[PDB]
């Protein structure tokens, strides 16, 4: 039941609770170890030890050093940690603020932990390692590789926390090897040089965000990157992505993004609001996708893009802009405009674009290759129950229209076929 300060020389293990199956409830004070590979508050053991580190400063500093890093074996449930205040600050080549190994269990309320090392993540969670966190202000720097890094079936839930990574190749929130992350109130930020705000990739991991202004900058840095079967599902987020070569949301092979009612604004040089590659996005009740740059905002390539009750916008260069075998499907008023001619560009003339429009959609733009092409191309179109194209094509193959279908053509257009109904 420690209550006061505990300094330390350049020697590790300022406070460790390895075994004896007890609780510490350190009330407050300060630990300022500075050894090499020293750790202020290791709690695990070689081979239940609940602690409560109430407000207290752990400003260690040393190569390989790390603040409280309780780790426990797979068996026997786990160990409980609970913090508050505790401005844990580290500065070391690989110093972790919170590394939580097998079956760990922690709950945080006002952590506000900082690091400045070389490849030092703020909180890394290994196997097991369920985490509940509020008011986190973790901010990383240096040439590291990630802020909160969740791995191998970990389960973390952040509320009202903010993550501000810095330094080149730094990821805001990196989840992979299975996860159940849930962010609510988070405002993950970032600095450029290939610094995706949120990277999720297992084909088993799943992130569910809520009103979290994922924001990047600098060189190519996907705001949200879903890889190898990852699964994001947003709720009123703001994926501002002002950065050269950036991407509002990059959904890669086997991945699936359930974006819903969230602004996804990409800005800067060649960058797409949403790049779906051999995956399946679904913008349900969304609110926007902008490009404003060189590239289009809705780049499909073998992807099942499904807008619904949202505006995909070619504000800068182009709208959908498929190049591949897409399966686009607008409905319920998807104002896929481009503030320009040629809403749905497509570089490949024969890109099999099984486009669609249903029940309220408005395609307010043209279709066009990157050149002039009179050949036969693999592009379709459909409309019904209010679907309304409002543009010129010059490049479509079949434009079959169903009941309530309204093409409302505007100018010269060579079309390989039509079917009115």
């Amino acid at each position: 039941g420690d209550v006061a300060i505990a300094t330390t020389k350049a020697s590790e293990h300022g406070i460790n609770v390895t075994g004896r199956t007890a609780e510490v409830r350190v009330t407050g004070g300060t630990i300022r170890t500075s050894g090499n590979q020293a750790q202020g508050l290791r709690v695990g053991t070689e081979n239940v030890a609940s602690v409560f580190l109430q407000n207290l400063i752990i400003e260690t500093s040393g190569t390989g050093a790390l603040g409280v890093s309780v780790h426990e074996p797979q068996g026997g449930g786990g160990t409980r940690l609970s913090m508050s205040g505790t401005t844990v600050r580290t500065r070391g080549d690989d110093s972790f603020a919170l590394q939580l190994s097998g079956p760990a269990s922690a709950t945080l309320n006002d952590v506000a932990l900082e690091t400045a090392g070389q490849q030092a993540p703020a909180v890394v969670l290994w196997q097991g390692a369920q985490l509940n966190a509020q008011g986190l202000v973790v901010q990383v720097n240096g040439a590291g590789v990630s802020a909160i890094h969740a791995q191998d079936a970990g389960s973390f839930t952040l509320s009202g926390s903010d993550i501000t990574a810095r330094g080149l190749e730094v990821v805001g929130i990196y989840v992979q090897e299975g996860m159940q992350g849930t962010l609510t109130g988070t405002r993950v930020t970032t600095q450029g040089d290939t610094a995706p705000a949120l990277q999720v990739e297992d084909a088993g991991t799943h992130v569910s965000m809520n009103g979290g202004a994922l924001s990047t900058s600098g060189a190519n840095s996907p705001a949200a990157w879903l890889l190898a079967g990852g699964s994001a599902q947003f709720r009123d987020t703001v994926l501002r992505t002002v950065g050269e070569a950036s991407h509002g949301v990059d959904v890669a092979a086997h991945s699936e993004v359930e974006l819903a009612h969230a602004q996804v604004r990409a800005d800067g040089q060649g960058a797409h609001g949403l790049v779906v590659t051999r995956s399946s996005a679904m913008v349900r009740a969304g609110s926007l996708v902008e490009s404003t740059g060189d590239g289009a905002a809705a780049l499909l390539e073998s992807g099942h893009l499904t807008v619904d009750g949202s505006v995909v916008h070619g504000h800068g260069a182009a709208g959908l802009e498929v190049d591949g075998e897409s399966n686009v499907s607008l409905l319920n008023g998807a104002r896929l405009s481009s503030d320009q001619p040629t809403a749905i560009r497509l570089i490949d003339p024969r890109s099999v674009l099984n486009l669609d429009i249903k029940d309220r959609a408005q395609l307010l733009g043209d279709i066009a290759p990157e050149a002039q092409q009179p050949e036969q191309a693999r592009v379709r179109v459909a409309l019904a129950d209010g679907g309304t194209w409002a543009g010129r094509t010059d490049g479509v193959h079949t434009v079959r229209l169903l009941d309530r279908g309204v093409w409302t053509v505007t100018g010269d257009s060579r079309v390989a076929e039509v079917k009115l109904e």
């Binding site: 290994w126 196997q127 590789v145 990196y174 990739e201 890889l227 092979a253 570089i347 490949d348 693999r378």
Partner: protein, 378 residues
């Protein structure tokens, strides 16, 4: 006059040339690739070893006369009096790829002892002599080549001419393996785009395989470099998108372009990556005679002079053959996989889904040992 016995140049220039030798090798590899892409069929994956062709042609040169000497010298893009090249070539000989180059001739044909001894000293081999007849001679050719390449090259040469005064021969197969073992299980069927049709092809996958990747705008291509054993690097050039046809990249490839690409690559770093790539297995037999014709060279066809090699007034290559074998799979040099304590966070995802141009490279001497292209990865 015939060229005098070679002088073993001082070790001073033994390494003062390796730069010039590497640049000449790269230029020759580009030229020979263009010739091959000419001769072969359009959508036909091919592989060849500019290293081995260069070595065999250097053998010929050492046995060359004067006019053909100069012609082949220009073809290989060598400086005049590039003597140490011979010894220089020996320095380039790497342990990762096993080569077999040889010269056969009719027992009637006479071979100057000077050339025999010099070649034995440098190239550690001497012109084999054929039997009195030919058919059994072809049998012997095939058997010798097969048993001197660990049986990898089974049936090297078949269409041997009825009359054969002289023959060159060469064949090489890569022996180095992946410096980082690929998982077998990760191999999966995936979509490959040879044309509009999309095929399901096997491909191995690595979660965090250390690649060296970037984009060269001029050629409008993505270049990815992978590591091997024996200090070897597999460079793969893929079109930027699914639209850019590989013919486009091949034609757009120029000496300076390729040199800049390779240098910028070598200065790069091996950032982790989610890597997907199809199992590469390319075999290629081919008659060099057509290629030699299509490189402005003709002495192999007309008015061949090889005093340094023989004395026959009627001199000609009856049939010069080449064979190359490449096979890469999950058989890496070592399972480099790591444990949970890693924070790697794979950065840039790399996957080849269309016919690519691949060069295997030394990076210890900066010359392309192998070169070719893959269209049908099966």
């Amino acid at each position: 006059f015939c060229p005098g016995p070679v002088t073993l140049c001082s070790d001073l220039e033994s390494h003062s040339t390796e730069a010039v030798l590497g640049d000449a090798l790269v230029d020759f590899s580009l030229k020979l690739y263009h010739a091959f892409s000419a001769m072969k069929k359009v959508e036909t994956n091919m592989a060849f070893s500019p290293f081995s062709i260069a070595s065999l042609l250097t053998q010929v040169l050492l046995g060359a006369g004067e006019n053909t000497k100069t012609n082949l010298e220009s073809i290989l893009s060598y400086p005049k009096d590039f003597t140490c090249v011979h010894q220089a070539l020996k320095g380039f000989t790497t342990k990762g790829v096993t080569s077999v180059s040889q010269i056969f001739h009719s027992p009637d044909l006479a071979i100057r002892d000077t050339f025999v001894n010099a070649s034995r000293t440098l190239y550690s081999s001497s012109p084999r002599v054929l039997s009195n007849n030919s058919d059994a001679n072809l049998e012997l050719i095939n058997t010798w080549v097969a048993k001197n390449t660990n049986n990898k090259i089974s049936r090297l040469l078949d269409s041997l001419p009825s009359d054969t005064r002289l023959v060159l021969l060469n064949a090489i197969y890569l022996s180095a393996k992946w410096k980082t073992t690929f998982d077998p299980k990760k191999t999966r069927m995936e979509p490959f785009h040879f044309k509009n049709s999309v095929i399901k092809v096997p491909m191995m996958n690595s979660k965090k395989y250390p690649v060296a990747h970037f984009i060269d705008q001029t050629l409008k291509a993505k270049v990815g470099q992978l590591q091997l054993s024996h200090n070897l690097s597999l460079v793969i050039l893929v079109p930027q998108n699914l639209k850019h046809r590989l013919e486009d990249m091949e034609q757009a490839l120029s000496p300076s372009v390729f040199k800049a690409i390779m240098e910028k690559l070598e200065m790069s770093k091996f950032q982790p990556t989610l890597l997907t790539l199809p199992r590469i297995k390319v075999t290629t037999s081919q008659d060099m005679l057509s290629i030699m014709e299509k490189l402005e060279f003709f002495d192999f066809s007309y008015d061949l002079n090889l005093c340094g090699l023989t004395e026959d007034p009627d001199l000609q290559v009856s049939a010069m053959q080449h064979q190359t074998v490449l096979e890469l799979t999950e058989t890496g040099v070592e399972a480099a996989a790591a444990s949970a304590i890693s924070v790697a966070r794979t950065l840039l995802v790399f996957e080849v889904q269309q016919p690519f141009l691949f060069v295997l490279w030394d990076q210890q001497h900066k010359f392309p040992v192998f070169m070719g292209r893959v269209y049908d990865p099966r």
